[PDB]
Symmetry: D2
């Protein structure tokens, strides 16, 4: 009976008589920094999530144009720290937030530039749809950046970046900046003005210790809150996804849904998410795959890595190409449709929702 009621259809039984005494009470509320629940229940406590953030798509071709022009006109260095352009959700009041929890940006580093070293409580990762040439130095450990690589920079790790070539590179940054600003957890420290090691090894020290499947160094027996892997290289991700599709061909369980291969990047000390606030995945859909529509608590962002296809959000189809980016705010129904084989990088605030027992998932047909 009452379970089908919403805030529009429910009887409003707390409507006081509009008298001078009531207006005086309400005036007194304002003077005393008091705001009654009864005038705002439905907004404070909706039937289901109703984000101020809206679903939205940014074209890579547009992001690249603006990043390149920024490369001409704006020098990178101290103070501003990075030449990064945050994707700003139209629904979030002028804040540089792609969602209420996450920052997503395109960053551009021109020939031979250095972005100086700093650290901050905010967790961060880099992802590269295309390019090479930059190394990012994380606690003194140079990490090469290449197409298809996920690079991590967990909170409070010193990091700076350098272009070792005569050619520009762009990539995307994800951070829990919006969550951290609203929740007041932000600390920041300036490090050196130049990265602490200009060497450019093929593979970082973190990788050389931690990227052997199923093996753990005896010197690393303590679990970490964030992954000690600095780089999740394209080769491994590509091979994982191929094997899932091959295993499917062979009638063996592997794919998460038919024609839908997918992995989660994990902290190898625990098997959990890469960082406390941020979950990263990579999806590969066979040509013609259409995912079942999901509603999920919290926000996610995808970047198209390869192939052609579309996303549906709130019933609306938007065609997508290589590098395009979209955000799905909390509880917005979404699905992906593959035209060709369709590869996507994904990040979300799901580790926050799951840690606090706020996660819910509705899946079409299930």
């Amino acid at each position: 009976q009452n379970e089908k009621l919403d805030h529009e259809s429910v009887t409003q039984a707390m409507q006081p008589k509009d008298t001078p005494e009531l207006r005086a009470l309400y005036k007194s509320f304002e003077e005393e920094s008091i705001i009654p629940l009864w005038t705002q229940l439905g907004d404070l406590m909706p039937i289901h999530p109703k984000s101020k953030a809206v679903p939205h798509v940014w074209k890579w071709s547009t992001l690249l144009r603006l990043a390149r022009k920024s490369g001409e006109l704006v020098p990178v260095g101290r103070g501003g720290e990075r030449r990064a352009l945050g994707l700003a959700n139209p629904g979030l009041g002028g804040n540089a937030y792609i969602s209420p929890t996450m920052w997503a940006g395109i960053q551009y580093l021109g020939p031979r530039e250095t972005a100086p070293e700093h650290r901050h409580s905010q967790n961060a990762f880099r992802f590269v749809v295309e390019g090479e040439g930059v190394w990012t130095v994380v606690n003194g450990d140079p990490v090469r950046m290449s197409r298809g690589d996920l690079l991590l920079t967990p909170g409070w790790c010193f990091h700076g970046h350098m272009n070792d070539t005569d050619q520009p590179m762009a990539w995307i940054d994800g951070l829990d900046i919006p969550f951290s600003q609203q929740m007041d957890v932000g600390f920041f420290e300036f490090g050196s003005d130049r990265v602490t090691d200009y060497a450019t090894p093929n593979f970082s020290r973190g990788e050389r210790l931690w990227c052997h499947p199923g093996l753990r160094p005896l010197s690393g027996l303590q679990n970490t809150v964030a992954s000690p892997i600095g780089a999740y290289r394209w080769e491994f991700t590509d091979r994982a996804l191929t094997e899932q599709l091959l295993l499917e061909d062979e009638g063996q369980p592997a794919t998460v849904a038919p024609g839908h291969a997918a992995i989660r990047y994990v902290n190898p000390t625990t098997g959990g998410d890469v960082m406390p606030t941020l979950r990263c995945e990579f999806h590969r859909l066979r040509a013609g795959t259409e995912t079942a529509t999901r509603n999920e608590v919290g926000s996610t962002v995808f970047q198209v890595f390869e192939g052609a296809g579309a996303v549906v959000m709130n019933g609306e189809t938007t065609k997508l190409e290589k590098g395009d980016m979209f955000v799905v705010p909390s509880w917005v129904p979404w699905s992906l449709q593959a035209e060709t084989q369709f590869d996507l990088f994904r990040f979300s605030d799901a580790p926050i929702m799951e840690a606090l027992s706020f996660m819910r998932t509705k899946i079409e047909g299930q």
Copy 2:
């Protein structure tokens, strides 16, 4: 060297030449929903937390006057749901938030009133500095409300309240409403218009199963995300705190600091916090005790339960009496000073900060 720099003293090296091409770039950013990092680094990523919320104190005598007047002029019922007055931080832009994460309110239920049944993903607790007469029915289990009691209503539990007497009662509510609204995790369901059981037992079913020290029913071997204890009664809290002070008198370790007894209300299935987002404590300071100044990540709220004393926040002393309430936003230096024996109820968002590895603590002298 660079570790002592802040956003005011650092060199700003990303100041572009102010030309028509630059203004055209910046205009293009606006059209494309792009906001560059370099114009806002320092605000997005402060050196240490700088909350928009400000420290603030609400007098119980004022809260009571406004709650009582609301009792005359505003009927309680469906739609508005509760006659509750939220403490609204002056720094939080007109939102009914005591801090960026927490709602705190005074609720008033007059003679023989019922507040109807509903549930919501938001976690909630009731605390009572004074009064008796109300029972709150939580998933059908009537729970008596009395002076000094902490009553819990974890997320998604049906709850409504009824005054069984001819006398009014007031109490405080705490909820993770602000966190839940900003993060988009809110669900809500209307239940019955009248509580489902009007019986008024001395002790609830939850208590009769779970409030025997060190004992666990074989029917309750599964751990819960929130405490199954609906009521943490004043008797136990009072006795715990007395025993700590007695143990101190006897030269035995017990108190958390000298003359400072304190407990945390816990989920007995895990030994952890009562609910995923909210931590509740109770403190008792010997006359003359002055706590060491703390900076802590995240916000806390205290209500004075008994005795006289003061709080210091940002170096500013405010004298406190029975029922007065104050909020300490993230990283604000705070201490308590006991004039007489000084009893306080405390809640905070610390389980959020600790789950996500954002907690930090600075203690004066340590």
Copy 3:
């Protein structure tokens, strides 16, 4: 097909030709400390557990006679340490083991005696069906021993005992002595020759900190591997079990099965078992209750605390009275039958089996 085969009915296909060369091979095995699998598969790896321990019952009246006579003839003191009589399973080859994992003993302390202080890696508890007068001093904290009390002495805690009266007292000890001896984990240290504190408070320091339901001292926020509660007093256990039966009367879920109230004694820092190797429970069956037959991996021991009834093991009924003790070895089918209201104390090695993922449970009808 092959799933119904056992070691008696399976084809034995590794029967070598009995030749001089084979006997020479087998002789060589002996010289080289080699024992082939094929001559002993079925014994090493049975179809289901087949303990050398047998179900067995010890009469309290017999245990008391022998303990009392030991009180006359054997002095208690250093070296031998305790006047304790271990229940020795007839199936375990003369070892003083009630089961392959547990020691159970009756201990007797005469008027004004002291049993001196020591510690050992082996975990221990005391349980009292009857008597008063002894205090056990655990890390310097005197703990009163009374009828119905469970007293804990986790591994590596100094403990000694003293009779403060002119009257003898007996109780039962449980320890993981057999597990610890076979697995080679035993350490032992002699402490003082007399307990370190002869005071006899009603309640220990551990209890005064930890026995308030749902409350945790801020000085005790670190979780422990064993419970910091030294005494689980009869009052709480009795009240817990009564409330379950009352809740059942009221149509409310509480009892573990119909007419079967039961609790587990738990570590309040975690909600888990009292000690890493040993699980303690207390059961109360309504007159006429018959439990469903269980097979469970690992061994358990019960002592009858009050009332009359029977146990069935391997289909065999043995009538039981106050104080009688029985052991149920691994996978032996067992049930309890209540003649009157039937109260039993229970301990087991279940935390070992569950930690190592060896637990299985078969329940009749389910």
Copy 4:
């Protein structure tokens, strides 16, 4: 004072007068299945672990001779199940136990033989110092066996083995058979008489899903009690150990001690041990390395994989060659000395000791 006392030097104060009444008491103890503590304290509860197992070394050349001769004279098949020769500790009374917890055996499979399919609660792994040709089929998933590979068969997984060539292969088995027999946790089921899949892929399905560093299939988000990796191939182990030694050369932390590279094989869903009862490691010592002497609770076994060196146990040096095996019982002081670069495979019961909080470690110089 009393801390330096042991069971040989302590005063024995419970020596009763040897009278007819005492001998009658003691006789009565025997009739009633009672064994007093005071006549056996020191044996039941030693000052530190004193295993019945003794340190011992088995020569690979001897193991190979006996396995090969067994290959001629004993057919492999149903009933006996495997042609495996257990290493029997001289101190363990004729039981086929290398230590009180572990079985270690050499298994031999001749040209074209099949060992039929079964499962058991006991956990198992295979390790190969030399050879190729056998596949082991684990829950229907064929897993190739090659030099340097660790193959897993967690408890209750169906497994059988087949030689796909005209050449014999030998390897070592480790199981928690002794623990499981003494603790009564053993279940066993006969599966098919022939393996269920004779195909011989280079890599199993488990590996194709789980052996990509830092990546987890979305279809495998549930944690497992044992590793889903069926094969830890030599390539990865070799590369891990090389990188540690290279990182050391570069002044970077990696090795567990100087010139001592080492990894632990882990469950990738948790970062923990491969199976609940058994820990597997692989060590590589630079020529000339001498490890610091350790005492550790519980037993370990090593097999020499490559190079030459020695072990010291109880102060006694034994020179070791490729394939030689040794056991170090609980609390025996041990160290390894590398003559050439010295590679060893290691297994132990450490996950049992650590789960139950019985682990202790003494390291020389630290």
